[PDB]
Design a protein around this ligand. Structure first.
Ligand SMILES: CC1(C)CCC(C)(C)c2cc(C3(c4ccc(C(=O)[O-])cc4)OCCO3)ccc21
Ligand SMILES: CC1(C)CCC(C)(C)c2cc(C3(c4ccc(C(=O)[O-])cc4)OCCO3)ccc21
Lengths: 208, 9, 209, 11
């Protein structure tokens, strides 16, 4: 059972890149708290719980900070209160990936007026990835995954009628979200390799 | 895998 | 305005290891370009938009093409040249990891939900009609063309497969696995370019610009 | 700039 109400509850609970990395490490704590309030999440084997979170942090954090930033149509609102603008990201050498985020997520979510419930559903769909290698039972994960988008098409059709393709429009941001999510990994892996860019403790455990 | 394990209890 | 019968008529209208896969990919690119023209309203677009669309999503229109035709092959992939590449041949060539992902996240799922060429056809059209591509002249028409595709795909599923209500979502949820595979498939092809050990034919070189 | 693709798209 995946009531769309409980998922909405879970969501409601210098160097620019360095400031972005300080914030990624901080939000990783909040991510772990978010997943725990997802219906039936904490009931999984921690063998799987760790795999689900270690396979989607780049994508769950990308979505979160993207939705915060629907208000500031200039750059990104970070979890620490700092705003990173297109110029700071371009002048610091990350303009390429930073423009995608604004283009493919922040602005798309603004134009369709995506709310905090559809975001929690979409993050929860990303969370329950049955394609994550080494899961104890990928079938139970996908069982929970189907339960989620079921509550989302139902929520879409009732709250947003006369918009039959809004439920599909939402799911067609998951490919973009992954394209970006893997690009931040490669970017983050690279900052660690060069080693002259600070990285906090939790962000390393997530980079193996 | 320490901080991730601990953060779940 | 975007019927599934015309889209399916497009899929049917077009029919050691690494080197063979790069040959198959080259020959399959010529077939992709002809698949795209038979997709409704694709050729009405600016020629510079047609270039941007195919050139941004071939790495995963091809992966989808070979994945679905490999539903019959067990633990292996059937290439467009008729040659099978086996999982054992894959690991042997040093590319075992990504080969396994195609066998698990793609071929295996298209098999378990028995994906047909119409669903594949619309899924590929949705991939072709991606308004996020960089440099387009009119992303709105591309977005409205994409909206026409999956609006038609949702209807095909509701009329043909009424016993599976979530059949529409299961198809769309295969698109993120594809973006992942296609990117890792470029990151490999690009490396095969630097060393020059693998012969890479003309057309495939151009896409690997 | 994309020789074989422009040529394949017209015919
Ligand atoms: C590549 C680099 C440094 C610049 C481009 C953007 C802003 C997309 C980015 C985003 C991330 C992030 C991230 C997400 C959210 C937050 C936050 O909540 O403040 C902080 C970081 O890391 C997990 C995924 O996205 C990491 C690195 C980068
Ligand atoms: C990395 C390497 C060699 C191994 C893993 C697999 C076999 C999936 C793969 C697939 C591709 C391909 C491709 C797709 C279809 C065909 C075909 O059907 O002939 C041939 C190649 O190229 C673009 C994307 O997918 C390229 C490289 C690789």
């Amino acid at each position: 059972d995946m009531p769309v109400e409980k998922i909405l509850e879970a969501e409601l609970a210098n160097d620019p890149v360095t400031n972005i990395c300080q914030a990624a490490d901080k939000q990783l704590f909040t991510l772990v708290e978010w997943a725990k309030r997802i219906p039936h999440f904490s009931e999984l084997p921690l063998d799987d719980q760790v795999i689900l979170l270690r396979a989607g942090w780049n994508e769950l954090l990308a979505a979160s900070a993207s939705h915060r930033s629907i208000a500031v149509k200039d750059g990104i609102l970070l979890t620490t209160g700092l705003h990173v603008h297109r110029n700071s990201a371009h002048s610091a050498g990350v303009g390429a990936i930073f423009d995608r985020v604004l283009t493919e997520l922040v602005s798309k979510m603004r134009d369709m007026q995506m709310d905090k419930t559809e975001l929690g559903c979409l993050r929860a769909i990303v969370l329950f990835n049955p394609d994550s290698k080494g899961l104890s039972n990928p079938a139970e994960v996908e069982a929970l995954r189907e339960k989620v988008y079921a509550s989302l098409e139902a929520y879409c059709k009732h709250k947003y009628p006369e918009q039959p393709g809004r439920f599909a429009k939402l799911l067609l941001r998951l490919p973009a979200l992954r394209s970006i999510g893997l690009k931040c990994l490669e970017h983050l892996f690279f900052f660690k390799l060069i080693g002259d860019t600070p990285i906090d403790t939790f962000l390393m455990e997530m980079l193996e | 895998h320490k901080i991730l394990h601990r953060l779940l209890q």
